[PDB]
Amino acid sequence: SQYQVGPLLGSGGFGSVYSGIRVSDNLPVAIKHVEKDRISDWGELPNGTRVPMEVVLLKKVSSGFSGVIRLLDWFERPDSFVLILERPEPVQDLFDFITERGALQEELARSFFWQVLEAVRHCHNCGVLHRDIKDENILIDLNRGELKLIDFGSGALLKDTVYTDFDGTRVYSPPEWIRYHRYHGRSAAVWSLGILLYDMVCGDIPFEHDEEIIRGQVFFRQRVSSECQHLIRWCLALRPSDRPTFEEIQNHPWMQDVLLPQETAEIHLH
């Protein structure tokens, strides 16, 4: 009764997400219902309370401002958890944005990719690994030109040792996962970021099948500058240790002179 429930925004086997309004101040929110039977990965609060890892991860990153969706509150029900999340308005996810506009001008792709990089750096700094970076999980605040990372439902605490579990998106998953069901956090993130950048500048992902992912041969179907092509192929290095660090990505020549978010909005969104 504390929130006015609006239309369904999306759903899966994990659960369902509704547009909503906080009654007290009319704040736009998203109301995410997570089925207890579909969680798999349980976390624990400091106070000791088994919650979805998603709640743990969001609290670790929901602190000050960033390009990460804020968790405003959460509730437990007999068979589910309910998460109350920030909702920008107007908003569009990157998948829909690219679907409508096609391949993005590199100046726009640079701005978006830079903001995603800053958001992911914030997560890793907070000890959080997202594990499902992709266009569908990136919201665009259309008025402000600001991007926000969503859905930490496949995430994990960041660690320096190998991960053997994965339930993110396969076509964004690295060849070492496909081949050996093993990956390390940062290098796997960088791979998905390579897929994402290709998606931005070409208007579709580079690989569809397992065999393409493990071959790692990148074909460009759109005109893309040599510098951008280089960064993409670097992020998509077959050997994980050959991939760039976040610092190397942001220091790449293609990444220089990024637009401010409001400039990005004024030029590309308005």
Ligand SMILES: COc1ccc2c(c1CN1CCNCC1)O/C(=C\c1c[nH]c3cccnc13)C2=O
């Ligand atoms: C299958 O649909 C899902 C799954 C997980 C999440 C989710 C949605 C709904 N749509 C999100 C964009 N891509 C299409 C699906 O939304 C989330 C968080 C949100 C926080 N504020 C928002 C505002 C507008 C939409 N979503 C959110 C999620 O974790």
